[PDB]
């Protein structure tokens, strides 16, 4: 019945949460995998998530189908788009909740781009996916990324706050949003999200491992549930060491 | 069978009606919530509606799902769009009548933008929602907001009158429209709406509490069923006192 | 089985037909109602149609649902658009044949705009509606109004003729088209309609009552089944009187 | 099972075929009916087809529904557009295979415009119609008319050849294409069509009847199954004479 | 259950694979068939595939339906577009997995154009097709061709790599991508494809047969499963002899 609660049981048993994000292959393509070549291998990602004690991984259906082994809770990211694309931002489902269920997913993921000239297309589709999520008792995790239209600065405190509120209004049981850069403004985003837990979208690799930790601590001060981190772990050679330190910070 | 009657029974037992609108989170975003921070909390809105003696609240499905507790009749607002959006005005359903039913809604809401380059998209979708509203015996409340195309002044008396008529034509069992600024032109809108009750869309916060009371006054003079108010209540620090003021005005009782 | 015959039996028992059109509330808005304020009231329209001895009324579903009382045969106009709209002409269904049936309609109506950039959109939807009309045994009345694309003069004899032929080709059991201004060219439109009866679209209120009556005689001379009249009746203060004059002319 | 064979059995019992095309009322409008006024009457067209010994007629659903009497095999042309239209060429179905079946059709017809900015819309819809044609055991006749995009000269030999091949690729059981003007290049179009029989699209009424009869002779020797002729028969005052001379030539 | 394995069993019994591609009739049209006229005949293609000992053929549904005889495993290419088309690249299904099954296909094929302004349209459709492929136990082969948007050089190593990764992400069980021109960059594409086998898209006729075989060599060094070759076999007057050479090289 309560899907936020189901999400928390599964992805935040310790009261905070670290998700290893891995939809990069479609969203950005494989170029970033070159810094740490093993990252192109989804098997490595599963081992990495498990060895670091993380709460979950995010796979596109193709990766889930060919590689998922049940060893770490899965969020199946249902839509995806490429950076090669030049239109108004849009990302459509390449899979379904029902198929995610049969692949052993514990939750489903969907990106919206509020403000886009295609914002309606994603809301329309989200309606079906939200309905399916409830039907299959799978928490819906919304990546809420305002982009297009009037959006100029994506990390502006008013834009991140709008992102968080939109996700709540649309039925998200958990959400993933960009960091504002400082914990005071980010906590307003966290507040307007209400009962719905907020994960920080990790983003591009930071100059040092130190800068990222400082961000993560900011996020926690603000009251977020934790982080959904991709590049900033698996793009690094010392992925597991750095992952473990992310664990110590977030969990203890 | 008669859904306007069902709406009136539920949302206007006293013969007039106040609805506490709260779809703002999606439509405008959370910035407005800063003036009175508790307004960001839907639990506060439910208490506020109940404590003021209001007839209902309007929630988007997400808020309804996570917060609705059955303590005040609910209109589930089915579609929503953002102000970040720049195209021809369009607002698509993010939920369904069937789901609204299971969330305890007593009515459903839907916005149309007559005149928009996308007007057909909303009419197309309203056809399905209207059919579902009848099927689930849930009154359909239409927010009728002419915008785009030839519309320049939204509160023009001819535009508000068109808005009211369009809602009636398309099957609204109750409607919500912008005020013209004066009761004589607004009553023409109310007249062309015929059997379908008209609620005034509250709008942006007025310089003073009494500016808004004067508007409501005129709205009642015109023969409207009442008001769907959002900001002008919950953006104020003294939301209950002022809500209670509106309640004295609208339910009168002389 | 034969829907044109069903239409004639219901809407033309006297061998000719007058329909009181009342979809104007959506199409043009309520400004026209100001000349004769009672016309804003659909109850007045029903009384007017009945007292004049007319054959039917045309309502949008909202008006049918709230006001229709079975006292005059109903054509439920399925689609509608506004004059506030600025794009390529398009009008989509806001209701269905199945619902019209349950509201006591005796026929359904649908506008197409041949030549529009959106002509395909209406043809696509007409396919579904025509199929439904046959299924529910409800005659389909097609308002055939070439507009957009290459159309410059809507009352041009070649354009009205095309309009009439398109309606026949697409499955209309009865049609409504604009008058050419003279009975010679209008009778070519009537001729290309073949077995499908043609009603004249009444149009904007004429300078004098006699101007209109003379158009109606032209229409009848050309072999049309009659008129679908709106404003030219209900926009006048003497609606019933003038309606009764129209009845004497058309029914004989 | 084999629909090309069923087509040949019904529309080419003599081993060649003449189809009397009559979708012109929607495609071009009724202006061409003026040269020979009876041609506006579908009843005349059925008599004409039968009296000339032709194999079939092509009707839009409206004309089929109101006029078809089972006296000559029918190809129900499913889609139609107008010349008033100005956008990228598109023609959508205004009817269905299932309804065609119930109207006594022996085959169904569908136009595609390869190259059009809307080419995808027609291929999408063709998929459904092809599936339906197989399901109802009704041969699919594809009018293949490259238009829009890069197409400048429609009767260019490479364009007509492309048109033929596309029809074969998409599932046509018989096809209708424009003549190149000479039997050498037209027989390459016929060759790339493979097992799928090719009918020449008749086109605008030729200056002189011999001008048409020659096209016919070149089409036949190029190895086409025959002709789908409209205006070049029914626009003529000597309609039945020419049709009977067209027959003697096609059937040998 | 495992569709990649089913694909390998059927199309790569020898551990490597040669597919004879023949969707060109729609994609490019019949002009290329002129160099070796027998190539226009699908019967010749089947004979050619079989006599060369190849693993399969790719047909569009129309060709499969009229010509497929079960003599060589079939991949039914579900979507197709023309070169006459000028818009943002898009190719929609003209057929279905269910129909492919009944035509004796052993796999289904679908093209995506990542980067296109219409990329979402194909991802949307791929979702349905992928689901159908799993349901009917037919391996999905994805032609992954970045085009439109930001794509300028299609054979750029980063673009081909992205192509490969997207195919994996979306659920491809085997994929077909363009060669980079050198085996070092092509093997990065092969690596990011992970468990999903990669076939080289053959492409346009090479200046010399030698140039083609050295590209094939490259492809094999890079660790690809083999080649999907069309024009480079069947456009050659000595098709069979050269095909029998391609065999020798690929299978050892």
Concatenate the DSSP letters of all residues of B180-195 into one string: -SSHHHHHHHHHHTTT
CA dist., res. D30 & res. C191, Å (int) = 10
B169, B172, B196, best to mutate vs chain C, most C CBs in 10 Å? B169
Whether B121 has a binding-site annotation, put simply, is no
DSSP character for A139?
P
Q: Output the 3-class SS for D47-67.
A: HHHHHCCCCEEEEEHHHHHHH
User: Does E166 contact chain A (CB < 8 Å)?
Assistant: yes
Active site residue E145: yes
Which residue, chain included where needed, has tokens 């069993």?
E9
CA dist., res. E104 & res. A165, Å (int) = 52
CB E249 within 8 Å of CB E41 = no
C81, C82, C110, best to mutate vs chain B, most B CBs in 10 Å? C82
Residues of E in contact with D169 (CB under 8 A): 23, 25-26, 60-63, 80
CB A55 within 8 Å of CB A19 = yes
CA dist., res. D252 & res. D247, Å (int) = 8
User: Does B214 contact chain C (CB < 8 Å)?
Assistant: no
Q: Output the 3-class SS for D202-241.
A: CCCCCCCHHHHHHHHHHHHHCCCCEEEECHHHHCCCCHHH
Backbone torsion region of residue C3, taken as left when φ is above 0, otherwise alpha when ψ lies between -120 and 50, otherwise beta: alpha
CA dist., res. A214 & res. A237, Å (int) = 20
CA dist., res. D76 & res. D98, Å (int) = 11
Q: Which residues, in sequence order, are bridge partners of residue E142?
A: E110, E175
User: Does D166 contact chain E (CB < 8 Å)?
Assistant: yes
User: Whose CA is closest to C26, among B185, B142, B180?
Assistant: B142
Inter-chain residue contact B29 with A194, CB threshold 8 Å = no
- Compute how many other C-beta atoms are within 10 angstroms of the C-beta atom of residue D146: 29
Greatest Cα pair distance, chain D, in angstroms, is 44
Inter-chain residue contact D30 with C123, CB threshold 8 Å = no
CA dist., res. C82 & res. C76, Å (int) = 17
- Number of cross-chain residue pairs from B and C with Cβ atoms under 8 Å apart: 117
CB E121 within 8 Å of CB E92 = yes
User: Does B6 contact chain C (CB < 8 Å)?
Assistant: no
CA dist., res. B164 & res. B143, Å (int) = 9
Residues 6+ apart with CB under 8 A from C130: C140, C170, C171, D61, D94, D95
Q: Is A202 helix (H, G, I), strand (E, B) or coil?
A: coil
CB E64 within 8 Å of CB E105 = yes
Q: Is A77 helix (H, G, I), strand (E, B) or coil?
A: strand
CA dist., res. D99 & res. C232, Å (int) = 40
Query: Chain B closest CA to A8's CA: distance in Å?
Result: 15
| CATH code linked to domain A1-252 | 3.20.20.70
* % helix, strand, coil for chain A, step of 5: 45, 15, 40
DSSP character for B118?
T
CB D111 within 8 Å of CB D79 = yes
CB A193 within 8 Å of CB A170 = no
**Token code pair at residue A28:** 């950005």
Tally helices (H) and strands (E) across chain D: 11, 10
Work out whether the CA dihedral C239, C242, C248, C250 comes out positive or negative: negative
CA dist., res. E44 & res. D61, Å (int) = 40
Method in brief: X-ray
**How many CA atoms are closer than 13 Å to the CA of C43, on its beta-carbon side?**
6
Query: Chain E closest CA to D193's CA: distance in Å?
Result: 9
Q: Give the resolution to one decimal, in Å.
A: 2.4
Inter-chain residue contact B86 with A148, CB threshold 8 Å = yes
**Token code pair at residue C6:** 């069903």
Backbone torsion region of residue C223, taken as left when φ is above 0, otherwise alpha when ψ lies between -120 and 50, otherwise beta: left
Backbone torsion region of residue C144, taken as left when φ is above 0, otherwise alpha when ψ lies between -120 and 50, otherwise beta: beta
User: Does D148 contact chain E (CB < 8 Å)?
Assistant: yes
Q: Output the 3-class SS for chain C.
A: CCHHHHHHHHHCCCCCEEEEECCHHHHCCHHHHHCCHHHHCHHHHHHHHHHCCCCEEEEEHHHHHHHCCCCCCEEEECEECCCCCCCCCCCEECCCHHHHHHCCCCEEEEEECCCCCCHHHHHHHHHHHHHHHHHCCCCEEEEECCCCCCCCCCCCHHHHHHHHHHHHHHCCCEEEECCCCCHHHHHHHHHHCCCCCEEEECCCCCCCHHHHHHHHHHHHHCCCCEEEECHHHHCCCCHHHHHHHHHHHHHC
CB B7 within 8 Å of CB B173 = yes
CA dist., res. E246 & res. E252, Å (int) = 10
Residues 6+ apart with CB under 8 A from C117: C87, C88, C148, C149, D85, D86, D87
Residues of A in contact with B37 (CB under 8 A): 191
Catalytic residues of D: 145, 176
Calculate the CA B170 to chain-centre distance: 17
Work out whether the CA dihedral E238, E243, E249, E252 comes out positive or negative: negative
CA dist., res. A171 & res. D198, Å (int) = 56
Angle, alpha carbons C112-C117-C121 (nearest 5°): 50
Query: Chain A closest CA to B230's CA: distance in Å?
Result: 16
User: Does D158 contact chain E (CB < 8 Å)?
Assistant: yes
CA dist., res. B232 & res. B158, Å (int) = 25
Alpha helix stretches (DSSP H) within chain A: 3-11, 24-27, 42-51, 61-67, 97-102, 119-135, 157-170, 183-192, 209-221, 231-234, 239-251
User: Does A157 contact chain B (CB < 8 Å)?
Assistant: no
Q: Where are the domains of chain B?
A: 1-254
B82, B86, B116, B119, best to mutate vs chain A, most A CBs in 10 Å? B82
CB D73 within 8 Å of CB D55 = yes
Backbone torsion region of residue D183, taken as left when φ is above 0, otherwise alpha when ψ lies between -120 and 50, otherwise beta: alpha
- Compute how many other C-beta atoms are within 10 angstroms of the C-beta atom of residue C38: 14
**Token code pair at residue E91:** 């190719």
Query: Chain D closest CA to E121's CA: distance in Å?
Result: 11
- Number of cross-chain residue pairs from A and E with Cβ atoms under 8 Å apart: 114
Query: Chain E closest CA to D45's CA: distance in Å?
Result: 33
User: Does D120 contact chain C (CB < 8 Å)?
Assistant: no
Which residue, chain included where needed, has tokens 């960009």?
A178
Residues of E in contact with A40 (CB under 8 A): 191-192, 194
Instruction: Give B1-254's CATH code, choosing from 3.30.70.120, 3.30.70.20, 1.10.287.3510, 3.20.20.70.
Output: 3.20.20.70
CA dist., res. C247 & res. C17, Å (int) = 9
């Amino acid at each position: 019945a309560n899907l936020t609660e189901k999400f928390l049981r599964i992805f935040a048993r310790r009261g905070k949460s670290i998700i290893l994000a891995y939809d990069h292959g479609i969203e950005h393509g494989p170029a970033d995998f070159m810094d740490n070549p093993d990252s192109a291998d989804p098997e490595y990602i599963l081992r990495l998530a498990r060895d670091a004690g993380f709460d979950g991984v995010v796979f596109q259906r193709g990766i889930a189908e060919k590689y998922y082994d049940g060893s770490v809770p899965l969020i199946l990211k249902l839509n995806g788009k490429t950076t090669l694309y030049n239109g108004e931002p849009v990302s459509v489902a390449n899979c379904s909740v029902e198929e995610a269920v049969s692949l052993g997913a514990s939750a489903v993921g969907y990106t919206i781009y509020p403000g886009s000239g295609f914002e309606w297309k994603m809301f329309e589709e989200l309606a079906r996916i939200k309905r399916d999520a409830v039907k299959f008792d799978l928490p819906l995790v919304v990546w809420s990324y305002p982009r297009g239209g009037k959006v100029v600065n994506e990390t502006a405190p008013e834009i991140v706050a709008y992102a968080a509120r939109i996700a709540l209004e649309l039925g998200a049981d958990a959400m993933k949003i960009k960091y504002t850069g400082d914990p005071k403004t980010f906590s307003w985003a966290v507040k307007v999200a209400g009962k719905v837990p907020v994960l920080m979208s990790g983003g591009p690799k930071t100059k040092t491992e130190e800068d990222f930790l400082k961000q993560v601590e900011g996020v926690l001060e603000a009251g977020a549930l934790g982080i959904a981190v991709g590049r900033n772990v698996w793009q690094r050679r010392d992925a597991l060491k750095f992952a473990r330190a992310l664990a110590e910070l977030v969990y203890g």
